[PDB]
PDB file of all heavy atoms in Angstrom:
ATOM      1  N   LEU A   1     -13.817 -58.113 -85.203  1.00 58.15           N
ATOM      2  CA  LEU A   1     -12.775 -57.643 -86.097  1.00 58.15           C
ATOM      3  C   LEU A   1     -11.380 -57.964 -85.584  1.00 58.15           C
ATOM      4  O   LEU A   1     -10.411 -57.324 -85.999  1.00 58.15           O
ATOM      5  CB  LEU A   1     -12.945 -56.148 -86.350  1.00 58.15           C
ATOM      6  CG  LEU A   1     -12.937 -55.211 -85.152  1.00 58.15           C
ATOM      7  CD1 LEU A   1     -11.539 -54.782 -84.852  1.00 58.15           C
ATOM      8  CD2 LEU A   1     -13.813 -54.012 -85.425  1.00 58.15           C
ATOM      9  N   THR A   2     -11.302 -59.024 -84.780  1.00 58.98           N
ATOM     10  CA  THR A   2     -10.055 -59.535 -84.225  1.00 58.98           C
ATOM     11  C   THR A   2      -9.923 -61.015 -84.603  1.00 58.98           C
ATOM     12  O   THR A   2      -8.827 -61.504 -84.874  1.00 58.98           O
ATOM     13  CB  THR A   2     -10.009 -59.388 -82.695  1.00 58.98           C
ATOM     14  OG1 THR A   2      -9.722 -58.027 -82.350  1.00 58.98           O
ATOM     15  CG2 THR A   2      -8.937 -60.293 -82.105  1.00 58.98           C
ATOM     16  N   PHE A   3     -11.056 -61.718 -84.616  1.00 59.08           N
ATOM     17  CA  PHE A   3     -11.118 -63.125 -84.974  1.00 59.08           C
ATOM     18  C   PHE A   3     -12.057 -63.415 -86.131  1.00 59.08           C
ATOM     19  O   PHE A   3     -12.370 -64.584 -86.366  1.00 59.08           O
ATOM     20  CB  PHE A   3     -11.552 -63.959 -83.767  1.00 59.08           C
ATOM     21  CG  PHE A   3     -10.572 -63.941 -82.642  1.00 59.08           C
ATOM     22  CD1 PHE A   3     -10.760 -63.113 -81.561  1.00 59.08           C
ATOM     23  CD2 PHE A   3      -9.460 -64.753 -82.666  1.00 59.08           C
ATOM     24  CE1 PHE A   3      -9.859 -63.096 -80.522  1.00 59.08           C
ATOM     25  CE2 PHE A   3      -8.558 -64.739 -81.629  1.00 59.08           C
ATOM     26  CZ  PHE A   3      -8.759 -63.909 -80.556  1.00 59.08           C
ATOM     27  N   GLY A   4     -12.523 -62.402 -86.843  1.00 54.69           N
ATOM     28  CA  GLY A   4     -13.406 -62.625 -87.968  1.00 54.69           C
ATOM     29  C   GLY A   4     -14.869 -62.575 -87.576  1.00 54.69           C
ATOM     30  O   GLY A   4     -15.276 -63.087 -86.534  1.00 54.69           O
ATOM     31  N   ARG A   5     -15.674 -61.959 -88.440  1.00 53.61           N
ATOM     32  CA  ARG A   5     -17.101 -61.826 -88.170  1.00 53.61           C
ATOM     33  C   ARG A   5     -17.794 -63.178 -88.146  1.00 53.61           C
ATOM     34  O   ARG A   5     -18.897 -63.307 -87.605  1.00 53.61           O
ATOM     35  CB  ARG A   5     -17.736 -60.927 -89.224  1.00 53.61           C
ATOM     36  CG  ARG A   5     -19.225 -60.711 -89.087  1.00 53.61           C
ATOM     37  CD  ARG A   5     -19.669 -59.715 -90.141  1.00 53.61           C
ATOM     38  NE  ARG A   5     -21.104 -59.473 -90.131  1.00 53.61           N
ATOM     39  CZ  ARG A   5     -21.707 -58.590 -90.916  1.00 53.61           C
ATOM     40  NH1 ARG A   5     -20.993 -57.860 -91.764  1.00 53.61           N
ATOM     41  NH2 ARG A   5     -23.020 -58.426 -90.850  1.00 53.61           N
ATOM     42  N   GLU A   6     -17.176 -64.193 -88.744  1.00 54.64           N
ATOM     43  CA  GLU A   6     -17.826 -65.490 -88.844  1.00 54.64           C
ATOM     44  C   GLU A   6     -17.327 -66.458 -87.785  1.00 54.64           C
ATOM     45  O   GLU A   6     -18.005 -67.445 -87.487  1.00 54.64           O
ATOM     46  CB  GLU A   6     -17.612 -66.076 -90.235  1.00 54.64           C
ATOM     47  CG  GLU A   6     -18.304 -67.401 -90.444  1.00 54.64           C
ATOM     48  CD  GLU A   6     -19.809 -67.281 -90.372  1.00 54.64           C
ATOM     49  OE1 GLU A   6     -20.328 -66.177 -90.633  1.00 54.64           O
ATOM     50  OE2 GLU A   6     -20.473 -68.289 -90.054  1.00 54.64           O
ATOM     51  N   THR A   7     -16.153 -66.209 -87.210  1.00 55.35           N
ATOM     52  CA  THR A   7     -15.657 -67.116 -86.186  1.00 55.35           C
ATOM     53  C   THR A   7     -16.353 -66.882 -84.856  1.00 55.35           C
ATOM     54  O   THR A   7     -16.501 -67.814 -84.059  1.00 55.35           O
ATOM     55  CB  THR A   7     -14.152 -66.972 -86.018  1.00 55.35           C
ATOM     56  OG1 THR A   7     -13.511 -67.247 -87.265  1.00 55.35           O
ATOM     57  CG2 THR A   7     -13.660 -67.965 -84.994  1.00 55.35           C
ATOM     58  N   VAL A   8     -16.786 -65.651 -84.593  1.00 56.78           N
ATOM     59  CA  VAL A   8     -17.579 -65.401 -83.399  1.00 56.78           C
ATOM     60  C   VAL A   8     -18.897 -66.156 -83.479  1.00 56.78           C
ATOM     61  O   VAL A   8     -19.249 -66.925 -82.578  1.00 56.78           O
ATOM     62  CB  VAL A   8     -17.803 -63.895 -83.204  1.00 56.78           C
ATOM     63  CG1 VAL A   8     -18.771 -63.662 -82.091  1.00 56.78           C
ATOM     64  CG2 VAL A   8     -16.507 -63.227 -82.884  1.00 56.78           C
ATOM     65  N   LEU A   9     -19.628 -65.937 -84.569  1.00 56.44           N
ATOM     66  CA  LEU A   9     -20.907 -66.603 -84.776  1.00 56.44           C
ATOM     67  C   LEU A   9     -20.741 -68.111 -84.644  1.00 56.44           C
ATOM     68  O   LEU A   9     -21.636 -68.806 -84.161  1.00 56.44           O
ATOM     69  CB  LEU A   9     -21.477 -66.253 -86.151  1.00 56.44           C
ATOM     70  CG  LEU A   9     -21.916 -64.802 -86.353  1.00 56.44           C
ATOM     71  CD1 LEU A   9     -22.678 -64.650 -87.662  1.00 56.44           C
ATOM     72  CD2 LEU A   9     -22.760 -64.330 -85.179  1.00 56.44           C
ATOM     73  N   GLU A  10     -19.588 -68.611 -85.078  1.00 57.56           N
ATOM     74  CA  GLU A  10     -19.293 -70.036 -85.004  1.00 57.56           C
ATOM     75  C   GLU A  10     -18.903 -70.421 -83.582  1.00 57.56           C
ATOM     76  O   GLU A  10     -19.093 -71.562 -83.161  1.00 57.56           O
ATOM     77  CB  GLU A  10     -18.169 -70.403 -85.976  1.00 57.56           C
ATOM     78  CG  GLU A  10     -18.634 -70.626 -87.406  1.00 57.56           C
ATOM     79  CD  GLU A  10     -19.953 -71.369 -87.479  1.00 57.56           C
ATOM     80  OE1 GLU A  10     -20.111 -72.377 -86.759  1.00 57.56           O
ATOM     81  OE2 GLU A  10     -20.833 -70.945 -88.258  1.00 57.56           O
ATOM     82  N   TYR A  11     -18.357 -69.457 -82.848  1.00 56.59           N
ATOM     83  CA  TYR A  11     -17.945 -69.686 -81.468  1.00 56.59           C
ATOM     84  C   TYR A  11     -19.134 -69.541 -80.525  1.00 56.59           C
ATOM     85  O   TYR A  11     -19.231 -70.243 -79.519  1.00 56.59           O
ATOM     86  CB  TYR A  11     -16.835 -68.712 -81.069  1.00 56.59           C
ATOM     87  CG  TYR A  11     -16.596 -68.634 -79.578  1.00 56.59           C
ATOM     88  CD1 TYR A  11     -15.770 -69.549 -78.938  1.00 56.59           C
ATOM     89  CD2 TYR A  11     -17.196 -67.644 -78.809  1.00 56.59           C
ATOM     90  CE1 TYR A  11     -15.548 -69.481 -77.575  1.00 56.59           C
ATOM     91  CE2 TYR A  11     -16.980 -67.569 -77.447  1.00 56.59           C
ATOM     92  CZ  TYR A  11     -16.156 -68.489 -76.835  1.00 56.59           C
ATOM     93  OH  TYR A  11     -15.940 -68.418 -75.478  1.00 56.59           O
ATOM     94  N   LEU A  12     -20.038 -68.625 -80.861  1.00 57.03           N
ATOM     95  CA  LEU A  12     -21.225 -68.391 -80.049  1.00 57.03           C
ATOM     96  C   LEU A  12     -22.034 -69.676 -79.912  1.00 57.03           C
ATOM     97  O   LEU A  12     -22.462 -70.038 -78.816  1.00 57.03           O
ATOM     98  CB  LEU A  12     -22.089 -67.288 -80.665  1.00 57.03           C
ATOM     99  CG  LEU A  12     -21.822 -65.864 -80.176  1.00 57.03           C
ATOM    100  CD1 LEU A  12     -22.998 -64.956 -80.500  1.00 57.03           C
ATOM    101  CD2 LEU A  12     -21.529 -65.854 -78.683  1.00 57.03           C
ATOM    102  N   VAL A  13     -22.238 -70.359 -81.033  1.00 58.81           N
ATOM    103  CA  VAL A  13     -22.988 -71.608 -81.041  1.00 58.81           C
ATOM    104  C   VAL A  13     -22.165 -72.723 -80.409  1.00 58.81           C
ATOM    105  O   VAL A  13     -22.709 -73.640 -79.794  1.00 58.81           O
ATOM    106  CB  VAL A  13     -23.386 -72.020 -82.470  1.00 58.81           C
ATOM    107  CG1 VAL A  13     -24.024 -73.400 -82.466  1.00 58.81           C
ATOM    108  CG2 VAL A  13     -24.330 -70.992 -83.075  1.00 58.81           C
ATOM    109  N   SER A  14     -20.847 -72.635 -80.563  1.00 57.57           N
ATOM    110  CA  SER A  14     -19.941 -73.630 -80.004  1.00 57.57           C
ATOM    111  C   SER A  14     -19.865 -73.490 -78.488  1.00 57.57           C
ATOM    112  O   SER A  14     -19.682 -74.474 -77.771  1.00 57.57           O
ATOM    113  CB  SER A  14     -18.546 -73.490 -80.617  1.00 57.57           C
ATOM    114  OG  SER A  14     -17.792 -74.677 -80.447  1.00 57.57           O
ATOM    115  N   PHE A  15     -20.006 -72.258 -78.008  1.00 56.41           N
ATOM    116  CA  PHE A  15     -19.959 -71.984 -76.578  1.00 56.41           C
ATOM    117  C   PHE A  15     -21.333 -72.192 -75.949  1.00 56.41           C
ATOM    118  O   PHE A  15     -21.443 -72.645 -74.811  1.00 56.41           O
ATOM    119  CB  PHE A  15     -19.473 -70.556 -76.321  1.00 56.41           C
ATOM    120  CG  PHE A  15     -19.348 -70.214 -74.864  1.00 56.41           C
ATOM    121  CD1 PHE A  15     -18.221 -70.580 -74.147  1.00 56.41           C
ATOM    122  CD2 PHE A  15     -20.356 -69.524 -74.211  1.00 56.41           C
ATOM    123  CE1 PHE A  15     -18.101 -70.267 -72.807  1.00 56.41           C
ATOM    124  CE2 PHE A  15     -20.242 -69.206 -72.870  1.00 56.41           C
ATOM    125  CZ  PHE A  15     -19.113 -69.579 -72.167  1.00 56.41           C
ATOM    126  N   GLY A  16     -22.377 -71.856 -76.700  1.00 57.86           N
ATOM    127  CA  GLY A  16     -23.738 -72.010 -76.225  1.00 57.86           C
ATOM    128  C   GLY A  16     -24.082 -73.466 -75.986  1.00 57.86           C
ATOM    129  O   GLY A  16     -24.774 -73.802 -75.024  1.00 57.86           O
ATOM    130  N   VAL A  17     -23.597 -74.333 -76.868  1.00 60.74           N
ATOM    131  CA  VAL A  17     -23.845 -75.765 -76.752  1.00 60.74           C
ATOM    132  C   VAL A  17     -23.093 -76.337 -75.557  1.00 60.74           C
ATOM    133  O   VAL A  17     -23.486 -77.359 -74.993  1.00 60.74           O
ATOM    134  CB  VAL A  17     -23.419 -76.517 -78.026  1.00 60.74           C
ATOM    135  CG1 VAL A  17     -21.921 -76.780 -78.011  1.00 60.74           C
ATOM    136  CG2 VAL A  17     -24.195 -77.818 -78.158  1.00 60.74           C
ATOM    137  N   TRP A  18     -22.010 -75.668 -75.175  1.00 61.13           N
ATOM    138  CA  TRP A  18     -21.203 -76.099 -74.046  1.00 61.13           C
ATOM    139  C   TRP A  18     -21.935 -75.944 -72.728  1.00 61.13           C
ATOM    140  O   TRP A  18     -22.107 -76.930 -72.006  1.00 61.13           O
ATOM    141  CB  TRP A  18     -19.902 -75.312 -73.995  1.00 61.13           C
ATOM    142  CG  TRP A  18     -19.011 -75.737 -72.907  1.00 61.13           C
ATOM    143  CD1 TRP A  18     -18.326 -76.899 -72.827  1.00 61.13           C
ATOM    144  CD2 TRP A  18     -18.718 -75.014 -71.713  1.00 61.13           C
ATOM    145  NE1 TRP A  18     -17.606 -76.945 -71.664  1.00 61.13           N
ATOM    146  CE2 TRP A  18     -17.834 -75.795 -70.960  1.00 61.13           C
ATOM    147  CE3 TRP A  18     -19.116 -73.775 -71.212  1.00 61.13           C
ATOM    148  CZ2 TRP A  18     -17.340 -75.384 -69.733  1.00 61.13           C
ATOM    149  CZ3 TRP A  18     -18.624 -73.367 -69.996  1.00 61.13           C
ATOM    150  CH2 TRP A  18     -17.746 -74.168 -69.269  1.00 61.13           C
ATOM    151  N   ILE A  19     -22.384 -74.735 -72.401  1.00 64.01           N
ATOM    152  CA  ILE A  19     -23.041 -74.503 -71.122  1.00 64.01           C
ATOM    153  C   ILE A  19     -24.321 -75.308 -70.981  1.00 64.01           C
ATOM    154  O   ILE A  19     -24.609 -75.827 -69.897  1.00 64.01           O
ATOM    155  CB  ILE A  19     -23.336 -73.014 -70.910  1.00 64.01           C
ATOM    156  CG1 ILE A  19     -22.046 -72.251 -70.682  1.00 64.01           C
ATOM    157  CG2 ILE A  19     -24.264 -72.821 -69.742  1.00 64.01           C
ATOM    158  CD1 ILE A  19     -22.271 -70.795 -70.569  1.00 64.01           C
ATOM    159  N   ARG A  20     -25.104 -75.426 -72.047  1.00 60.01           N
ATOM    160  CA  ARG A  20     -26.344 -76.178 -71.967  1.00 60.01           C
ATOM    161  C   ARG A  20     -26.109 -77.644 -71.656  1.00 60.01           C
ATOM    162  O   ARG A  20     -26.981 -78.283 -71.062  1.00 60.01           O
ATOM    163  CB  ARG A  20     -27.117 -76.039 -73.270  1.00 60.01           C
ATOM    164  CG  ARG A  20     -27.482 -74.612 -73.594  1.00 60.01           C
ATOM    165  CD  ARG A  20     -28.528 -74.082 -72.646  1.00 60.01           C
ATOM    166  NE  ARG A  20     -28.999 -72.764 -73.053  1.00 60.01           N
ATOM    167  CZ  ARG A  20     -28.478 -71.621 -72.626  1.00 60.01           C
ATOM    168  NH1 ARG A  20     -27.466 -71.629 -71.772  1.00 60.01           N
ATOM    169  NH2 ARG A  20     -28.972 -70.469 -73.051  1.00 60.01           N
ATOM    170  N   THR A  21     -24.960 -78.186 -72.031  1.00 61.45           N
ATOM    171  CA  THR A  21     -24.644 -79.564 -71.697  1.00 61.45           C
ATOM    172  C   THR A  21     -24.554 -79.730 -70.185  1.00 61.45           C
ATOM    173  O   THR A  21     -24.083 -78.827 -69.491  1.00 61.45           O
ATOM    174  CB  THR A  21     -23.327 -79.977 -72.331  1.00 61.45           C
ATOM    175  OG1 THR A  21     -23.443 -79.901 -73.753  1.00 61.45           O
ATOM    176  CG2 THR A  21     -22.975 -81.384 -71.940  1.00 61.45           C
ATOM    177  N   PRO A  22     -25.009 -80.855 -69.644  1.00 61.55           N
ATOM    178  CA  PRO A  22     -24.851 -81.099 -68.216  1.00 61.55           C
ATOM    179  C   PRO A  22     -23.382 -81.151 -67.846  1.00 61.55           C
ATOM    180  O   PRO A  22     -22.534 -81.515 -68.676  1.00 61.55           O
ATOM    181  CB  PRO A  22     -25.527 -82.461 -68.014  1.00 61.55           C
ATOM    182  CG  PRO A  22     -26.470 -82.574 -69.144  1.00 61.55           C
ATOM    183  CD  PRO A  22     -25.784 -81.917 -70.296  1.00 61.55           C
ATOM    184  N   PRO A  23     -23.040 -80.826 -66.603  1.00 62.42           N
ATOM    185  CA  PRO A  23     -21.628 -80.610 -66.257  1.00 62.42           C
ATOM    186  C   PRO A  23     -20.782 -81.874 -66.246  1.00 62.42           C
ATOM    187  O   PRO A  23     -19.580 -81.822 -65.970  1.00 62.42           O
ATOM    188  CB  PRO A  23     -21.713 -79.981 -64.862  1.00 62.42           C
ATOM    189  CG  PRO A  23     -22.989 -80.490 -64.303  1.00 62.42           C
ATOM    190  CD  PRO A  23     -23.935 -80.597 -65.458  1.00 62.42           C
ATOM    191  N   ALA A  24     -21.384 -83.018 -66.558  1.00 65.24           N
ATOM    192  CA  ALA A  24     -20.666 -84.279 -66.451  1.00 65.24           C
ATOM    193  C   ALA A  24     -20.045 -84.699 -67.776  1.00 65.24           C
ATOM    194  O   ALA A  24     -18.965 -85.298 -67.797  1.00 65.24           O
ATOM    195  CB  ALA A  24     -21.604 -85.370 -65.934  1.00 65.24           C
ATOM    196  N   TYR A  25     -20.703 -84.391 -68.889  1.00 69.91           N
ATOM    197  CA  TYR A  25     -20.294 -84.929 -70.181  1.00 69.91           C
ATOM    198  C   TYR A  25     -19.662 -83.882 -71.080  1.00 69.91           C
ATOM    199  O   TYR A  25     -19.236 -84.206 -72.190  1.00 69.91           O
ATOM    200  CB  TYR A  25     -21.497 -85.558 -70.874  1.00 69.91           C
ATOM    201  CG  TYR A  25     -22.029 -86.736 -70.110  1.00 69.91           C
ATOM    202  CD1 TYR A  25     -23.049 -86.580 -69.188  1.00 69.91           C
ATOM    203  CD2 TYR A  25     -21.481 -87.994 -70.273  1.00 69.91           C
ATOM    204  CE1 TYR A  25     -23.530 -87.647 -68.474  1.00 69.91           C
ATOM    205  CE2 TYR A  25     -21.956 -89.069 -69.565  1.00 69.91           C
ATOM    206  CZ  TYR A  25     -22.979 -88.890 -68.666  1.00 69.91           C
ATOM    207  OH  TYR A  25     -23.455 -89.962 -67.953  1.00 69.91           O
ATOM    208  N   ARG A  26     -19.591 -82.638 -70.626  1.00 70.62           N
ATOM    209  CA  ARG A  26     -18.940 -81.587 -71.384  1.00 70.62           C
ATOM    210  C   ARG A  26     -17.476 -81.539 -70.996  1.00 70.62           C
ATOM    211  O   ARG A  26     -17.124 -81.859 -69.859  1.00 70.62           O
ATOM    212  CB  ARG A  26     -19.602 -80.243 -71.107  1.00 70.62           C
ATOM    213  CG  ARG A  26     -19.384 -79.742 -69.703  1.00 70.62           C
ATOM    214  CD  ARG A  26     -20.266 -78.550 -69.432  1.00 70.62           C
ATOM    215  NE  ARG A  26     -20.064 -78.006 -68.099  1.00 70.62           N
ATOM    216  CZ  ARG A  26     -20.792 -77.027 -67.583  1.00 70.62           C
ATOM    217  NH1 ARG A  26     -21.785 -76.503 -68.281  1.00 70.62           N
ATOM    218  NH2 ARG A  26     -20.541 -76.584 -66.362  1.00 70.62           N
ATOM    219  N   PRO A  27     -16.600 -81.149 -71.915  1.00 70.34           N
ATOM    220  CA  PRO A  27     -15.173 -81.140 -71.614  1.00 70.34           C
ATOM    221  C   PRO A  27     -14.861 -80.182 -70.485  1.00 70.34           C
ATOM    222  O   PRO A  27     -15.722 -79.394 -70.061  1.00 70.34           O
ATOM    223  CB  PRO A  27     -14.539 -80.676 -72.932  1.00 70.34           C
ATOM    224  CG  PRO A  27     -15.523 -81.033 -73.954  1.00 70.34           C
ATOM    225  CD  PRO A  27     -16.860 -80.826 -73.320  1.00 70.34           C
ATOM    226  N   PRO A  28     -13.640 -80.219 -69.956  1.00 68.54           N
ATOM    227  CA  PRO A  28     -13.305 -79.318 -68.847  1.00 68.54           C
ATOM    228  C   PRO A  28     -13.310 -77.857 -69.246  1.00 68.54           C
ATOM    229  O   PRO A  28     -13.922 -77.035 -68.556  1.00 68.54           O
ATOM    230  CB  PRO A  28     -11.906 -79.786 -68.437  1.00 68.54           C
ATOM    231  CG  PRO A  28     -11.333 -80.360 -69.690  1.00 68.54           C
ATOM    232  CD  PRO A  28     -12.478 -81.000 -70.412  1.00 68.54           C
ATOM    233  N   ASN A  29     -12.647 -77.510 -70.344  1.00 68.19           N
ATOM    234  CA  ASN A  29     -12.575 -76.139 -70.823  1.00 68.19           C
ATOM    235  C   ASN A  29     -13.639 -75.877 -71.880  1.00 68.19           C
ATOM    236  O   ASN A  29     -13.933 -76.737 -72.711  1.00 68.19           O
ATOM    237  CB  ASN A  29     -11.184 -75.844 -71.384  1.00 68.19           C
ATOM    238  CG  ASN A  29     -10.759 -76.838 -72.451  1.00 68.19           C
ATOM    239  OD1 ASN A  29     -11.507 -77.743 -72.809  1.00 68.19           O
ATOM    240  ND2 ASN A  29      -9.547 -76.669 -72.966  1.00 68.19           N
ATOM    241  N   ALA A  30     -14.218 -74.685 -71.844  1.00 67.31           N
ATOM    242  CA  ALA A  30     -15.200 -74.324 -72.849  1.00 67.31           C
ATOM    243  C   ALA A  30     -14.516 -74.101 -74.191  1.00 67.31           C
ATOM    244  O   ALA A  30     -13.308 -73.871 -74.252  1.00 67.31           O
ATOM    245  CB  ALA A  30     -15.953 -73.066 -72.436  1.00 67.31           C
ATOM    246  N   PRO A  31     -15.263 -74.185 -75.286  1.00 67.69           N
ATOM    247  CA  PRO A  31     -14.660 -73.983 -76.606  1.00 67.69           C
ATOM    248  C   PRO A  31     -14.076 -72.590 -76.745  1.00 67.69           C
ATOM    249  O   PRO A  31     -14.405 -71.675 -75.987  1.00 67.69           O
ATOM    250  CB  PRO A  31     -15.832 -74.219 -77.562  1.00 67.69           C
ATOM    251  CG  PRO A  31     -16.758 -75.159 -76.788  1.00 67.69           C
ATOM    252  CD  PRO A  31     -16.654 -74.651 -75.374  1.00 67.69           C
ATOM    253  N   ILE A  32     -13.184 -72.435 -77.723  1.00 68.99           N
ATOM    254  CA  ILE A  32     -12.291 -71.285 -77.788  1.00 68.99           C
ATOM    255  C   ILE A  32     -12.312 -70.683 -79.187  1.00 68.99           C
ATOM    256  O   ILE A  32     -12.853 -71.263 -80.129  1.00 68.99           O
ATOM    257  CB  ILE A  32     -10.860 -71.677 -77.392  1.00 68.99           C
ATOM    258  CG1 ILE A  32     -10.310 -72.686 -78.394  1.00 68.99           C
ATOM    259  CG2 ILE A  32     -10.856 -72.282 -76.013  1.00 68.99           C
ATOM    260  CD1 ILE A  32      -8.846 -72.991 -78.215  1.00 68.99           C
TER     261      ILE A  32
END
């Protein structure tokens, strides 16, 4: 209720895909 009920769900998958990526090909900062 600060960033929208749908932006979290969209961020959760955006962040989840980040960590699972090997540390070489993922960007420096995690998605936001």
Side-chain angles (χ1 to χ4, degrees):
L1 58 89
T2 283
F3 295 99
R5 179 176 178 176
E6 182 64 25
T7 301
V8 172
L9 292 190
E10 277 320 314
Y11 165 84
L12 268 198
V13 173
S14 200
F15 182 82
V17 82
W18 182 70
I19 290 176
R20 300 290 187 268
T21 298
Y25 296 93
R26 68 190 182 186
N29 54 2
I32 64 172

